Design a protein around this ligand. Structure first.
Ligand SMILES: Nc1ncnc2c1ncn2[C@@H]1O[C@H](COP(=O)(O)OP(=O)(O)OP(=O)(O)O)[C@@H](O)[C@H]1O
Ligand SMILES: *C(=O)CCCC[C@@H]1SC[C@@H]2NC(=O)N[C@@H]21
Ligand SMILES: [Mn+2]
Ligand SMILES: [Mn+2]
Lengths: 86, 541, 239, 181, 79
């Protein structure tokens, strides 16, 4: 592509605790976890930039990251799947 | 019906009539709430309101809107909700001799409409005339009695009975005479329709109190919360002994809608009379409608705060969001505040009249027309001899909408109608009975098979609109069953949607991609329906 | 007297049954699990129902009580269990009858009779058919191998009431897991032993009976092409 | 205690809008009786019953109430001054203020508010859960956002429940800033 | 990378509804008497049927069967 800004992300299924969805339209500023990792509850796994403002996305529980749908500097839309955990 | 009225009087609790399914969304969302969304919480609604007096779920603007904008049959909304909710009385708003349209129809039409409405599930008919002229309500009343269903006779409130200087026509005395008149006609329940939320809290106490000892009929009070004082008006109404009130669920309440049932339930804590209903469950309903409302953001009104200036222009609450949509479509978006300033002016131009449907519609049409052409009131004193008016505004001066208590000004009128002139009688008694047999034949021809009674008066009530609904149905099938987001926005790439068709029967549609427009502007949509590759070609407009 | 019919199964067999029923102008009902949301058989019946969001794909087609519930709600006259789920389950066939639902299959007594590989052998002997020489009943207590081997034949085989053994201390050490491998798949730790016939040809006979005493065979199927325990290729008639 | 401390005015801050109509009539009547301090009532219309509460407070003899202009009123804000003014028509006590000006002010803020749409709250409706959980002002919005941030979006009717329980675990406390956090 | 009708002196007929034309009842050259319906235009819940300002003979019709018109547009001219 030349970067990954054209990439369409699947929508997170809302009634599945494994699926973490994008809460706002933002930009992925920093990816912090990869496929097959295990960190504690509240682990800062993704850093988005909403609109000049920055929030870390945290894990709701303990578990193993199955998929990360995004890369650094990627645009996101409300309801976009970002992370899946076990 | 006789007995139900008697039972309401014995009841010390306040009886509640929910308007979420009709007047709440007519006030807030330009009446666009679809059947699907009502049918989804009908079972929960059936439980929560198991003790309510009625559910207002039909009539008003919904008949037009369902067939017209939503391309769904209002008869089907009725019957389905009927079957879904067998315990609570169904209430629908009927416009005297205008039924569910905008002018008077022949008497055999109103009769037929009530016969089919009652047969299909309506129980309580709220009859009202936009000029408070009782003569206009007789026909409807007679049709309702005959159907063995409950007839509710309405007076529509205007001005301020707390203020002698406002009017020496619409006084406390005005209403008492009008109520007493409605009692002799054998209406089962007396209704006070405060269409514009004009009924100040103190006035409701004074008003209900007088009526309650002027007639034996149980009093059904309806108001809008536009002032922000709706809850107060009800609390005062309840103190003076009111029998039933119209409320909406919290998330479909407030501003141009009715007061919040939820808020009210708690308001009467520690007071003598409490509200007969389930709060735990009304919270459930509020959470549901909270989300569903989100589906209709496109239809949300301009207002977001209570407005005290409504005591000046007296725009009806159920007209507000519908006429905001009319103005918007007519180049008058943004400029709505000027549309309200002259809606006040129009009113006094006509000699201080009652403004409800369709008399409000005429003031509304006169307001939109004069504001488009930068026309003032004095621009007709000697200059009316030409202008070219909206059908409704000339129709009013012909008297097709009835006779206002104070008539019109001869010279005021003439300059608008010149050619033929005014008719003095209530239209029903000269207008010839409509041929339902010829109408049967016409529809039996265009369509080629079984046609029902519902079809027939539907077409008589709404010629173009009905025809267009049939056109759409032939093309696209039954759209009621689509969820609202899909109905308004279609589908997104990679999305799957369940459409419920019947018990255990559903459509699983997945949209894969859409192709580029080919050398005809025809795009190819790649679908998957019930595990089956499918291609649909659409003209890109 | 079967107006409407439910298939307590999935896949090709559910599809096949639906077709059979359709041809008899019999209305059909499918069941599906969560993982089956998009299995084709779901779209081939007249009606379909999710077994429910309470049990996973594992126990979704094995949940006796919630399948009956779906059947009652749908006004079902009969359930066809196809093969390989509840198709041999006495309990399910009993519950069906207890609810006015016809179990499409043999009687309760036949399912009990043949649902146990010792009862079935007792039945075959009682009917005078050559059976595989083995234990006239089960074996539960220990040293179980060291009490049939040294008084039977050379090659043996231990099977659960649904592991080849060639003797010499491997009678137990290669048997160790025939107590627990019959616990993950099946609910029977009870076992029996048979004289392992080497180089056999597997032949099965198709039989159909009505409820009036009429019975016929539809000849044999050669099922000899098999890899370990699993069947692979079948031929009919046997060549 | 407060009169005795030498405060000039008794104020009641009803930060969560819990003070129901009858309760306000009851409270302020007894408080007029008990102290010689004037009472200054403050509340939030988050339940939808703000005005009614004020009408009762006025009936019980309250000296001052806190209001806001119509277009900056209601829900988690204060009851509307413009609405109350007309609400009181025909009752013994009136509101010492200027209508024509409230309207003019309302219109001003109406336009000015638009400059801040990016900062509007998501509260669109009166909410009566407050009478169970007691979350002050717009705190049930913050916690709803925060619970989403912790993957508890679907289980919020349990966060409301636990909050109510935690309050009793701490021995029933006043929840304003920062006791609410 | 519709002309607008005059609303002062010359006696044209300007559009007073910003919607669409439903029916054209008058021809290029036609005799028309007082208050004769000559144009039927439609908005949302509105309907203006255009009357004759005086009498005269219609010299032009500037709208067909189903045209979108703006406020103050040229539709007819009469003398
Ligand atoms: N006594 C035996 N000697 C040799 N092989 C045997 C013996 N018993 C069973 N088998 C093998 O196992 C197969 C059938 O027996 P098995 O124990 O697999 O029954 P099953 O799996 O319950 O059969 P099905 O799946 O048809 O119900 C035969 O094809 C054969 O290969
Ligand atoms: C279009 O068909 C939507 C209906 C808009 C008109 C409605 S009918 C009830 C309200 N009162 C009124 O006079 N106009 C509003
Ligand atoms: Mn109304
Ligand atoms: Mn405060």
């Amino acid at each position: 592509n030349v970067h990954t800004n054209a990439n369409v992300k699947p929508k997170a299924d809302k009634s599945n605790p494994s699926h973490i969805g994008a809460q706002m339209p933002g930009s992925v500023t920093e990816v912090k976890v990869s496929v097959g990792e295990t960190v504690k509850a509240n682990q800062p796994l993704l850093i988005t930039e909403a609109m000049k403002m920055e929030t870390t996305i945290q894990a709701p529980f303990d578990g193993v990251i199955k998929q990360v749908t995004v890369n650094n500097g990627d645009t996101i839309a409300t309801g976009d799947l970002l992370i899946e955990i076990e | 019906p006789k007995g139900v009225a008697e039972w309401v009087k014995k009841q010390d609790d306040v009886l509640l009539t929910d308007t979420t399914f009709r007047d709440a969304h007519q006030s807030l969302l330009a009446t666009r709430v679809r059947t699907k969304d009502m049918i989804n919480i009908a079972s929960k609604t059936a439980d929560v309101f198991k003790d309510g007096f009625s559910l207002e779920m039909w009539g008003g603007a919904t008949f037009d809107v369902a067939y017209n904008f939503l391309k769904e049959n209002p008869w089907e909304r009725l019957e389905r909700l009927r079957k879904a909710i067998p315990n609570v009385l169904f209430q629908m708003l009927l416009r005297a001799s205008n039924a569910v349209g905008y002018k008077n129809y022949p008497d055999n039409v109103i009769h037929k409409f009530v016969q089919e409405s009652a047969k299909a599930g309506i129980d309580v008919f709220r009859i009202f005339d936009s000029l408070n002229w009782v003569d206009q309500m007789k026909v409807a009343n007679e049709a309702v009695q005959e159907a063995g269903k409950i007839s509710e006779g309405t007076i529509c409130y205007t001005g301020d009975i707390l203020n002698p200087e406002r009017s020496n026509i619409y006084t406390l005395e005005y209403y008492v005479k009008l109520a007493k008149e409605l009692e002799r006609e054998g209406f089962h329940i007396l209704a006070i329709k405060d269409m514009a939320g004009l009924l100040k809290p103190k006035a409701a106490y004074e008003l209900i109190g007088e009526l309650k000892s002027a007639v034996d009929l149980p009093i059904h009070l309806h108001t809008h919360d536009t002032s922000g004082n709706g809850l107060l008006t009800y609390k005062q109404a309840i103190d003076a002994g009111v029998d039933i009130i119209d409320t909406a669920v919290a998330s479909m309440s407030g501003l141009t809608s009715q007061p919040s049932a939820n808020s009210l339930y708690y308001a009467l804590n520690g007071f003598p009379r409490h509200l007969r209903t389930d709060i735990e469950g009304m919270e459930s309903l509020s959470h549901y409608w909270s989300t569903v409302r989100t589906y209709y953001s496109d239809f949300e009104s301009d207002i977001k705060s209570p407005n005290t200036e409504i005591y000046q222009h007296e725009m009806p609450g159920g007209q507000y969001s519908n006429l905001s949509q009319q103005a918007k479509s007519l180049g008058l978006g943004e400029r709505f505040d000027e549309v309200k300033d002259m809606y006040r002016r129009v009113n006094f131009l006509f000699g201080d009249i009652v403004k409800v449907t369709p008399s409000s519609k005429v003031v509304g049409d006169m307001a939109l027309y004069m504001v488009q052409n930068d026309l003032d009131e004095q621009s007709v004193i000697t200059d009316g001899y030409k202008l070219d008016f909206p059908e409704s505004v000339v129709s009013f001066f012909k008297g097709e909408i009835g006779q206002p208590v104070n008539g019109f000004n001869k010279d005021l009128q003439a300059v608008i109608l010149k050619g033929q002139e005014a008719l003095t009688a209530r239209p029903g008694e000269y207008l010839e009975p409509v041929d339902f047999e010829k109408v049967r034949e016409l529809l039996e021809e265009e369509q080629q098979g079984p046609v029902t009674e519902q079809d027939i008066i539907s077409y008589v009530l709404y010629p173009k609109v009905y025809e267009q609904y049939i056109q759409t149905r032939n093309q696209y099938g039954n759209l009621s069953l689509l969820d609202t987001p899909t109905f308004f926005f279609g589908m997104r790439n990679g999305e799957t949607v369940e459409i419920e068709i019947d018990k255990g029967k559903r459509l699983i549609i997945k949209l894969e991609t859409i192709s580029e427009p080919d050398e005809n502007g025809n795009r190819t949509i790649y679908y998957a329906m019930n595990g089956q590759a499918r291609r649909i070609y659409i003209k890109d407009e | 007297q079967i107006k409407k019919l439910l298939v307590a199964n999935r896949g090709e067999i559910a599809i096949r049954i639906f077709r059979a029923a359709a041809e008899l102008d019999i209305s059909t009902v499918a069941i599906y699990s969560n993982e089956d949301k998009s299995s084709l058989h779901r779209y081939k019946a007249d009606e379909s129902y999710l077994v429910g969001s309470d049990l996973g794909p594992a126990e979704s087609y094995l949940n006796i009580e919630r399948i009956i519930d779906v059947a009652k709600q749908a006004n079902v006259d009969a359930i066809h269990p196809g093969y390989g789920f509840l198709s041999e389950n006495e309990q399910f066939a009993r519950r069906c009858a207890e609810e006015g639902i016809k179990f499409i299959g043999p009687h309760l007594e036949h399912l009990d009779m043949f649902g146990d590989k010792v009862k079935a052998r007792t039945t075959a002997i009682k009917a005078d058919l050559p059976v595989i020489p083995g234990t006239d009943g089960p074996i539960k207590s220990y040293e179980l191998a060291k009490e049939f081997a040294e008084e039977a034949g050379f090659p043996l085989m231990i099977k659960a009431t649904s592991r080849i053994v060639r003797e010499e201390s491997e009678l137990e050490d290669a048997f160790h897991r025939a107590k627990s491998e019959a616990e993950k798949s099946f609910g029977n730790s009870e076992v029996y032993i048979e004289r392992y016939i080497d180089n056999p040809k597997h032949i099965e006979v198709q039989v159909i009976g009505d409820e009036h005493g009429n019975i016929v065979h539809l000849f044999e199927r050669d099922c000899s092409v098999q890899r370990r325990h699993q069947k692979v290729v079948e031929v009919a008639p046997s060549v």
